[PDB]
Structure 1
Amino acid sequence: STGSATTTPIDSLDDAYITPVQIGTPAQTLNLDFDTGSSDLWVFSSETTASEVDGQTIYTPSKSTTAKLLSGATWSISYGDGSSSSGDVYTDTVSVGGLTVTGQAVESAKKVSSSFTEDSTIDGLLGLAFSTLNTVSPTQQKTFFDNAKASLDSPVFTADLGYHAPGTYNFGFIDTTAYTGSITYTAVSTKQGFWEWTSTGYAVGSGTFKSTSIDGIADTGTTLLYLPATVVSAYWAQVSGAKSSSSVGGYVFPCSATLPSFTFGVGSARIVIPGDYIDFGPISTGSSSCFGGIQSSAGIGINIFGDVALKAAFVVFNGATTPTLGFASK
């Protein structure tokens, strides 16, 4: 079997992407953020504290004939940006673009932190990292991808994110018309539970490529590209007037400046991120200072190839016995 669904940016900056997901019988459609950096499928629900819901579509397990309370199971997640959510667990039928999984753990949120409440367009998250990161206690649960794996024609999912435009998430097959040239595959380490890989270097604009190993994670749930301080400093040194601002919390640049492109290595292949993709607009309404899409990972502890980098490529997440990541130009 296969699945194919369209993903759409939530705003004009591509801060996040939402993909419609059908949960329960009869179907309840919720717009979820597909996150390859986490492993919990959690949603806003009829059980969420009324004051913490601001416009989201909620899942109502009492209206689903296939919903089952997973007696005594609880979940609690604390994301990298200080955001958190927690609640109880149900099992229910979940479908993504025609691909159906029965008995998928659906984590019903009882409490959500304010940053989730503020994003009215995001109804929950669909975790696509490895199942060892799932927070369900006392019995850890499998991701949607892990549950679908046996049924898929091929144990892969692909991410084709658009720049200020809709894109596609495909499950079970590789669309050979969605990319140009060939796909370069690279090794994945699953030790921390992430799609962790090693980039072979980088270039700023039309400069010389610097061969250096950069260990990072392919993360669809992170908006920006977080790289070591040395790399980020070399990029922003090429932008007149760019500087690191502690009040803003990162590198900012004059909105009138033209940004150079950024190249990252995947084996012997090169993926070019156009400079326009690194512009995240004014820091505040009316400001002539703009926020950069390439930031330091020094305070994070891990390098993250977020939406800024992934949207410049066709990306294959190969969940075979020995997992790999594929990258192609598009």
Structure 2
Amino acid sequence: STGSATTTPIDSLDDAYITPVQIGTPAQTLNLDFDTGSSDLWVFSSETTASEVDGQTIYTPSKSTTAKLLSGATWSISYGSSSSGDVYTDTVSVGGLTVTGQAVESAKKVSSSFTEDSTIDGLLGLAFSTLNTVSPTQQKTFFDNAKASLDSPVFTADLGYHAPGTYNFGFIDTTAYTGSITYTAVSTKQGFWEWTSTGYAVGSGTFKSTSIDGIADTGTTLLYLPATVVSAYWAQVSGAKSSSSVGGYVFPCSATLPSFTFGVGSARIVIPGDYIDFGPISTGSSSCFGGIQSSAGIGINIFGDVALKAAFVVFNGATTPTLGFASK
């Protein structure tokens, strides 16, 4: 089997992407944030504290003939945002690919940032199932459940810049990228799609060969890299500075940003400068927020949407997982 679904930015900055997901019988379609950095499929629901729902579409398990309470199971996750609740199993379909008996984690509580974002009805985790938070019986991700049935045990992320893109399951669309896909090793020890970039360049500058361990994370907006790398980038933008009050690098909105290149083995992925602009820090400001930020304090580097959207990315879930990157 295969599936293919379009993923759409939630706003004009590409702060996140939503993908329609069919849950239950008859189908209830919710728009979920596909997150390769976590492993829970959770939804706003009829059980969510009423004051914490503001415009989201909810899953109502009592209206699904295939829903079954997973007795005794609870979940709780943090991302400063958080959510928690209980668990059903139900039929879940993404882009024509159906999994029966998928754990659908129903939110009883969500933090303010979720409530405040009307466009995201929940999360669909695509990291390794070892990170799943359901207790006392850990549950599998949608991909883990589907894998055996897929034509090939892979999914791909093809995120758009200020435009829709695609998540495919079970096949690689050879028309969706240019050149070849370069594959690179993955460590699953922390539960993430963790890999090592071979270095970087800023603008038209020379490539610096240096190992940068990090995660391929569709659920993080920005590109978080070591302070040395990030300083080298922003030093090429007149007037850019790190602002403790704002919480990262800002730059004059009048700037033209340089590109940023990262290495995948001997291959190179170029992030255009425009992708690194996250717009005014507050409405009407001439100070703009940067899309490349320091990972110092996080504990891990994060190749979030800013980086991933510049590539066609293969999440290869074969017995020894790997990641593939192509230009597009």
State the 1:85 CA deviation.
Answer: 0.4
Unmatched runs of 5 consecutive residues or more in structure 2: none
Alpha-carbon displacement from aligned partner over 1:175-212 (angstroms, at most 9, x marks no partner):
00000000000000000000000000000000110000
Alpha-carbon displacement from aligned partner over 1:38-89 (angstroms, at most 9, x marks no partner):
000000000000000000000000000000001110001011xx11100000
Aligned residues: 328
Cα distance in 2 between the residues matched to 1:46 and 1:165: 32
Unmatched runs of 5 consecutive residues or more in structure 1: none
Alpha-carbon displacement from aligned partner over 1:262-285 (angstroms, at most 9, x marks no partner):
000000000000000000000011
- State the TM-score, normalized to the length of structure 2: 1.00
Cα distance in 1 between the residues matched to 2:73 and 2:7: 31
State the 1:99 CA deviation.
Answer: 0.2
Cα distance in 2 between the residues matched to 1:78 and 1:168: 27
Cα distance in 2 between the residues matched to 1:85 and 1:141: 17
State the 1:30 CA deviation.
Answer: 0.2
> Are 2:196 and 1:198 equivalent residues in the alignment?
yes
Cα distance in 1 between the residues matched to 2:255 and 2:14: 20
Q: 2:23 maps to what in 1?
A: 23
State the 1:299 CA deviation.
Answer: 1.6
State the 1:230 CA deviation.
Answer: 0.2
Cα distance in 1 between the residues matched to 2:113 and 2:85: 17
- SS of residue matched to 1:181: coil
Alpha-carbon displacement from aligned partner over 1:16-47 (angstroms, at most 9, x marks no partner):
00000000000000000000000000000000
Cα distance in 2 between the residues matched to 1:299 and 1:259: 25
Alpha-carbon displacement from aligned partner over 1:75-133 (angstroms, at most 9, x marks no partner):
01011xx1110000000000000000000000000000000000100000000000000
Alpha-carbon displacement from aligned partner over 1:142-183 (angstroms, at most 9, x marks no partner):
000000001100000000000000000000000000000000
Cα distance in 1 between the residues matched to 2:87 and 2:176: 37
Q: 2:8 maps to what in 1?
A: 8
Q: 2:187 maps to what in 1?
A: 189
Cα distance in 2 between the residues matched to 1:200 and 1:150: 32
State the 1:291 CA deviation.
Answer: 0.3
Alignment of 1:106-255 (within 5 A): 106-255=104-253
Cα distance in 2 between the residues matched to 1:327 and 1:164: 20
Alpha-carbon displacement from aligned partner over 1:242-294 (angstroms, at most 9, x marks no partner):
00000100000000011000000000000000000000000011111000000
Cα distance in 1 between the residues matched to 2:255 and 2:23: 46
Cα distance in 1 between the residues matched to 2:29 and 2:274: 33
Q: 1:41 maps to what in 2?
A: 41
Cα distance in 2 between the residues matched to 1:270 and 1:121: 34
4+ runs of 1 displaced by more than 2 Å? none
- SS of residue matched to 1:232: helix
